[model samples]
Target chain A: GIDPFTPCPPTNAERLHEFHRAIGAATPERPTPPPPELLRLRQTLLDEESAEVRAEIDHLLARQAAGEALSAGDLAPLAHELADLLYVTYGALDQLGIDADAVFAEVHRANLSKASGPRRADGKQLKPEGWRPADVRGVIERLQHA
Target chain B: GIDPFTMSDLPCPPTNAERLHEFHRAIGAATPERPTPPPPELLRLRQTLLDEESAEVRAEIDHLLARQAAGEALSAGDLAPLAHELADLLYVTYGALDQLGIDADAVFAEVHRANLSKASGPRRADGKQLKPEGWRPADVRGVIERLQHA
Candidate 1:
């Protein structure tokens, strides 16, 4: 069974191994570092994120307008969409001078301390009744600064 | 001016390299597998065909070209549209790879390896690095061919 809440693991080691080989082969008189290209890549990723989220929203709305029940199959697309969202988010954070692994760890730690929230009738976790947007913002700010 | 064709040297320190590898890995992981019999939407996109995906990429390229022709500055606000098109390009490319049953991870690795093995050249006017001529491989098909042969 696909657990919706399961953290999707980052891309595995085999690919990284090849990446290492690629990096090792460079021999430039003076090589320009990666930051400039990375900046552009970040912008590209945000665009992808925007498109994906919009598509998901449109999908949900179309189903809603038809008065169709949101079935398990309907939510399947979210598996990829959510993962892409996280992927792009990490990319953007990297460009913005944040350490993705550190941020991931901190946020995960903060979430771990939270009380269990309400669940949907189907058993998926829902936002708690009194959860405030400001509170969420504060947690992110603290973690970001920390 | 930066030679857009130049293969910028990858970030160093094993950690930064790891970050990039992680990025690619996540992208490959997030790409949905092609369904057996293929979905109608995917088929309509001609999913397995590089030409189809390339056309999608070209469409975005054309959009950017038009913007450039109009002398639009690539300011902060402009980044959204730029990013959107690039994302679409990547999405289409990934879809093609998924449909073709090619492992994007391995292909990416091989391509990266090729890039690393290349001799470097003088910096462009914009001070960006340049790769030796024929250093960079062609897009999707070129990469897949190299992976298959290797």
Candidate 2:
């Protein structure tokens, strides 16, 4: 419904800083108001109501942090997060008139076509397609100008 | 065991280039044959022979690729390949070393320290842990060299 790039004027650095603050306000930590179903699941798994579920959560969290509990089943949740993040990012890009996915595909294609030279500091010979030098300058310069 | 660094005394383009090439060789279509029963409980963890295994793995990969093709949560079958992939990558890095009794673990710690020192760029705003930043070619070179020495 909105043009991403031109619809909203380029967010200046001051605006960008405030934007992050607003996002944090929208999604506050601790006691996040999840829906009733999610709340029930959380209570079942995390509340003091079930000692067994509590232990399971502790063990799972520890193992997960230690990198031992991350199995395929783990990826489903991660996948959901990944999908959500990607979708949201793409939505933002769309609003800004940026074809992010297409740009990424194009970058990949460009990498295949351009025989990348020896790896640089970052290890990539060619910066992926969606990342244009101008994009970097534009974002930073906009921030500076703001 | 030969010293990994000593093997290519003539410094190749960079350590990252060698490491990347090694990884490509190790995982590319023509790497060493898959070992029989790779590690203890690996196959079991992956649940290799289940009738729905392929569909399951396909769904998982699709999910990874950003497609929500299925509703069920991931199973152990999915963990197997992901773990194996990580182990395989680690092993390939180790394989690049010349036969030596060097403790790869110790060397990795040292390299990590060295790479962490160079995190002043805008790209590395978060506390300089590995990943995100260390994926760079330069950091990778240090990683390979440290492994070689280790």
Candidate 3:
């Protein structure tokens, strides 16, 4: 049972699954691929959230370039946008019956292998030599009980 | 004001928002925002980034389905892009969220409450989750408002 007062991370797929099932959202009982049409719908929802995210970022960058000193007050729209996007994202993942948290775990492990990688222009890491991306499919299948 | 090395400086488990915020500043992407909503050239560059990455995400799923149609068994390489792209989608997402001082963890608490009760209501004919009658939508705006004041 979920504590009414305790907050959980957005990526908590199990809780999201419960919520999905409660709402009669698509939560397949067994491992299955999303039908092409269903996938399209899901992708479309994600795209909507993407636009919202970009709007937030764009506004922030636009402000930064305007020679205005920024403050925390200006982050309202961006934070709200991200919160909504995460809702849609984890919602879609839950519908697919994959454990979003587990997938993230695997990805983190794989990213750590980039310890020796070069930093990118954005100051993020570039995959090092012979770097291997995470086996996300494997994680998904395993989580799905395949 | 206080010394840097102190109990307050002790590292505890930081939320994802905190981590993203640190990385953003570390990469010189720090700063809050301007008073008025001013649009700029860099805005387009930042805005469409997510759109572009999501397209790659779509492309991967399409490729996966196409392979299934061809009756070919999936290989590691076949699935690599999906995971890689998905993670990239997240990487870009969190960084962008942090760029604007969003605490994702706090906001999701509000969203979670609304989502928790979806089962009490009736679903749509097409299985879409909807508010049956009085199910309250999340107070997403309220949360952001509080953050703005903070």
Candidates 1 and 2: which is better by DockQ?
Answer: 1
lDDT of candidate 1 over A1-146, digit per residue (tens): 67988523334222223333343422222111223445445546555664664566466656656775543234334324433443444334333333334333333333322224555678554555555322323333443445
For candidate 3, the docking band is acceptable
Please state every model's RMSD to the true fold in angstroms: 16.8, 24.1, 6.5
Q: Fraction of reference contacts reproduced per prediction?
A: 0.01, 0.00, 0.33
Between prediction 1 and prediction 2, the one with superior lDDT is: 1
Q: What are the runs in model 2 whose C-alpha is more than 4 Å off? A: A1-69, A110-115, A119-146, B1-150
Evaluated on CA atoms against the true complex, candidate 1 attains a DockQ of: 0.04
Clashing residue pairs for model 3: A22-B119, A70-B33
Best by lDDT: 3
Worst 10 residues of 2 chain A by lDDT: A25-34
TM-score of 2: 0.23
| Model 1: CA > 4 A from native | A1-37, A92-99, A114-146, B1-150
- After aligning candidate 3 to the native by TM-score, how far in Å is the CA of A107 from where it should be? 1.9
Tell me the docking grade of candidate 1: incorrect
Model 3: CA > 4 A from native: A1-11, A26-31, A59-73, A115-132, A144-146, B1-49, B65-80, B117-119, B124-134, B145-150
Q: Which docking category, incorrect, acceptable, medium or high, applies to candidate 2?
A: incorrect
Q: After superposition, how far is residue B138 of candidate 3 from its true place, in Å?
A: 2.9
Q: For residues A1-146, write the lDDT of model 2, one tens digit per residue.
A: 66987533322112222333433323221111123342233223212222332233344456655756343333222222222222222222232222232233333333333333345666545443444321222332232233
Ranking by DockQ: 3, 1, 2
